[PDB]
Amino acid sequence: RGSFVEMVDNLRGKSGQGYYVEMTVGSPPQTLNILVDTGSSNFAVGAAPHPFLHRYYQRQLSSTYRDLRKGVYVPYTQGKWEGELGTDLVSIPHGPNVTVRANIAAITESDKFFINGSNWEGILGLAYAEIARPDDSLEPFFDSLVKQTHVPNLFSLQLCGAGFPLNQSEVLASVGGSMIIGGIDHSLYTGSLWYTPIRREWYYEVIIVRVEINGQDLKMDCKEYNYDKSIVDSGTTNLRLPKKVFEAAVKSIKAASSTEKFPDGFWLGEQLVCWQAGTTPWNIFPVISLYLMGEVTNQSFRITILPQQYLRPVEDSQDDCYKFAISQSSTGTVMGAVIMEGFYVVFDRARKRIGFAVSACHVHDEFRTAAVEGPFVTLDMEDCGYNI
Ligand SMILES: CN1C(=N)N[C@](CCC2CCCCC2)(C[C@H]2CCC[C@@H](NC(=O)c3ccncc3)C2)C1=O
Numbered sequence: 001r002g003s004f005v006e007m008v009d010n011l012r013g014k015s016g017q018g019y020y021v022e023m024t025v026g027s028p029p030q031t032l033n034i035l036v037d038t039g040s041s042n043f044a045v046g047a048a049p050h051p052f053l054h055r056y057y058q059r060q061l062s063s064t065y066r067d068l069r070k071g072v073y074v075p076y077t078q079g080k081w082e083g084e085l086g087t088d089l090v091s092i093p094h095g096p097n098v099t100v101r102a103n104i105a106a107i108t109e110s111d112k113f114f115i116n117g118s119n120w121e122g123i124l125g126l127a128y129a130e131i132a133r134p135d136d137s138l139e140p141f142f143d144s145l146v147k148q149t150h151v152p153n154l155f156s157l158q159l160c161g162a163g164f165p166l167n168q169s170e171v172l173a174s175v176g177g178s179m180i181i182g183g184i185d186h187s188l189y190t191g192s193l194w195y196t197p198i199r200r201e202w203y204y205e206v207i208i209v210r211v212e213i214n215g216q217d218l219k220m221d222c223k224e225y226n227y228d229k230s231i232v233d234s235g236t237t238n239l240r241l242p243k244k245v246f247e248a249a250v251k252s253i254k255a256a257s258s259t260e261k262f263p264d265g266f267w268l269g270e271q272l273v274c275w276q277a278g279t280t281p282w283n284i285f286p287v288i289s290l291y292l293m294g295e296v297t298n299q300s301f302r303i304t305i306l307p308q309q310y311l312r313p314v315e316d317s318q319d320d321c322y323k324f325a326i327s328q329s330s331t332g333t334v335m336g337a338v339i340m341e342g343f344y345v346v347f348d349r350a351r352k353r354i355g356f357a358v359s360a361c362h363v364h365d366e367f368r369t370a371a372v373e374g375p376f377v378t379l380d381m382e383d384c385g386y387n388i
Pocket residue numbers: 018035037038039040041074075076077078112113114115123131133233234235236
């Protein structure tokens with residue numbers, strides 16, 4: 001049974017441009033589309049004209065706007081966002097039937113933040129206060145939601161990749177998934193939910209204990225897989241892996257798929273690869289299994305993704321084209337949107353754990369499916385975690 005009908009199918013978007021939910025801010029309510037970001041902790045919205053925005057938060061039109069008289073400067077690898085802090089009344093129309101008083105960062109300047117044609121005007125940082133900007137005293141949205149209402153301290157995400165390119169009109173008309181606030185909807189997954197501990201409450205940090213490519217053990221010291229951390233991030237497109245892990249994984253993926261040669265640009269995630277309509281050779285590409293620490297001592301489980309997850313559909317012709325959605329990182333593993341598209345992911349903050357189950361909307365073929373399986377006996381899993 002699906003017990004959260006009001007929130008099912010409340011997301012739109014895609015892996016490369018982000019998945020967003022409708023929200024309202026202020027009095028009278030101002031409707032805005034907001035990217036769901038499990039990799040950050042600020043509710044930050046466009047609040048001034050920008051070439052990529054067709055609407056923005058107008059503080060002067062909200063009777064409930066409260067100015068905190070404080071600026072916030074947020075540089076990150078790709079760019080930055082800057083703004084002015086305040087609070088206002090916020091609601092999620094296809095969400096819990098509540099209105100909360102929340103912090104809002106009114107974005108006034110940015111670089112490589114907004115995405116042209118993404119249809120979103122701000123981001124909802126769903127991670128913990130530790131990584132909120134300027135500091136941990138700026139209460140994140142979800143913390144405000146839980147404190148002010150009877151909403152359970154849990155949310156779950158079903159990000160639905162279409163498996164093919166969606167043009168501008170299609171991506172606006174299409175259901176991109178669900179964000180269930182305060183619960184788990186059983187219609188969004190098949191099989192069982194398996195839980196991994198949240199190692200520390202800052203990002204949604206997890207511990208990977210083993211990696212396989214078509215069942216072949218990558219055989220690295222498991223600390224390498226979590227160097228310097230492993231996180232679950234809906235605000236990142238790719239599966240990102242630490243340099244050494246990336247080099248070993250790409251070697252193994254190349255070897256498994258060696259019946260076809262792909263240019264260096266494809267493996268660097270820059271160049272698309274194309275096949276005649278319907279002839280994508282899924283079977284030559286391997287499945288990838290990530291083993292995660294379990295809730296029981298010396299127990300792990302595995303999540304298995306297909307090339308239908310790690311090859312991202314892009315438009316070129318009538319050919320079926322893709323980009324390789326696995327890339328190198330110098331800041332740890334990032335389980336981005338392309339990985340999350342395979343699974344229904346439960347962010348169980350109350351029980352400091354993340355659940356994974358096979359998504360009812362994952363893209364697959366008639367011969368293979370994504371999987372979530374366990375248990376496996378795995379020793380010294382705490383040693384897989386990186387310190388300092
Ligand atoms: C990974 N990642 C993420 N999950 N959220 C941010 C902020 C991280 C935050 C973590 C805690 C400390 C402070 C920083 C922000 C991201 C939001 C989605 C749109 C993105 N836009 C682009 O990447 C982009 C790139 C190029 N052109 C346009 C847009 C930018 C980020 O870098």
